[PDB]
């Protein structure tokens, strides 16, 4: 979960320092995200972290029928 | 927008803030289009308070997995 993100970064030979520099976010925010502390992360920060791992972050809201993208 | 979804659920900003047990200024920024600065747990509670569910997924090609 946190392990999944750690694995994704480590499979690309990036340190938490390098991902922090790629994402323009604090290394302390990289460590906390990787320790499972997703709840507390800001959206733009999580977005940047995931882009630095080569991913895309999809944030969606399901309300009854509809599902909207934020 | 969320504003439009919130309003469509008959709720006021003060009420959603109260129901989500979050600072109203937090709801104000989310509803004014500023999703970027929202903490995931804040956005999660705000969406639950509307009666909805928040999905956060990482996509790498066709591979996806949930974060929250």
Numbering used by the authors:
A (entry chain A): 31 to 100
B (entry chain B): 34 to 101
Authors' description from the paper:
The crystal structure of MtHigA2 was determined from three distinct crystal forms. Form I belonged to space group P212121 and was determined to 2.0 Å resolution, form II packed in space group P43212 and was determined to 3.2 Å resolution, and form III was solved in space group P3121 to 3.4 Å resolution. Due to a lack of electron density at the N-terminus, ∼25 residues are undefined in each monomer despite the relatively high resolution. All dimers share the β-lid as their major dimeric interface, but the position of the α-helix bundle varies. When the different dimers are aligned based on a single HTH motif from one monomer, the corresponding motif in the dimer pair shows a different relative position. The flexibility in dimerization leads to drastic changes in the locations of positively charged residues on the HTH motif, including His54, Arg56 and Arg59. The greatest change in distance is that between the Nδ atoms of His54, which move by ∼7 Å [Figs. 1(c) and 1(d)]. To predict the physiological dimer, each form was submitted to the PISA server to calculate the strength of the dimer interface. Interestingly, all of the forms had similarly favourable dissociation energies (ΔG): −14, −15 and −17 kcal mol−1 for forms I, II and III, respectively. This suggests that the flexibility of the β-lid does not impact the formation of a stable dimer and is likely to contribute to function.
